[PDB]
Design a protein around this ligand. Sequence first.
Ligand code: HEM
Length: 137
Amino acid sequence: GFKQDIATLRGDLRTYAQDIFLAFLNKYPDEKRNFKNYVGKSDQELKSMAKFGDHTEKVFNLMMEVADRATDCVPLASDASTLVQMKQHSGLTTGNFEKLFVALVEYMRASGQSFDSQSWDRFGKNLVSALSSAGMK
Ligand code: HEM
C-alpha cells in the first residue's frame, strides 16, 4: 500500500525522482516555464544538469517525508505550511502540485509494479487541499 510504496521509492529514490519529474515535465511542457534552464534539453541531458539532479532529489526527499508523516494519505498541516513558506515556491499555485501528482499517478499505473496508485492520487489531492488552507494561491 501507500507506506510500502514510500519504502519502494526510497529504495531507488534518485532514479524514481528523475523518472517521475521527467514524466511531469513531458506531460505538461508549459511547466518548464518555472525552469527557464530546462528548455531545449532531452531527458538524458536534464539528468546531466546540476540544478535538475539537485532539485529533483530534494523534491522527492521531502515529498517522501511528507508522505511518511501523513495519516491515511492526509498530510500534516505543518508540512503544507512549510511548503507554502519556501521562498523558491513564491511563483507557484496549487495547479503546479496537482500536475506533478497526476504525472506521478500515471507513472505508477504504467509501471510493472504493485504501487497503490489510488492512495497516491488521494495523497496528491489531500496535499493540494492542505497547501490551499496554508495559503498557496
Ligand atoms: C511535493 C512537491 C515539491 C517539493 C517537496 C519541493 C521542494 C523544493 C525544495 C526542497 C526546493 C529547494 C531545494 C534546494 O534548494 O536544494 C525547491 C525549489 C524549487 N522548486 Fe520545488 N518542490 C516541489 C514541487 C515543485 C513544483 C511542482 C515546482 C514547479 C512546477 C517547483 C519549482 C521549484 C523551483 C523553481 C525551485 C527553485 C529553483 C530550482 O528549481 O532550481 N517545485 N523545491
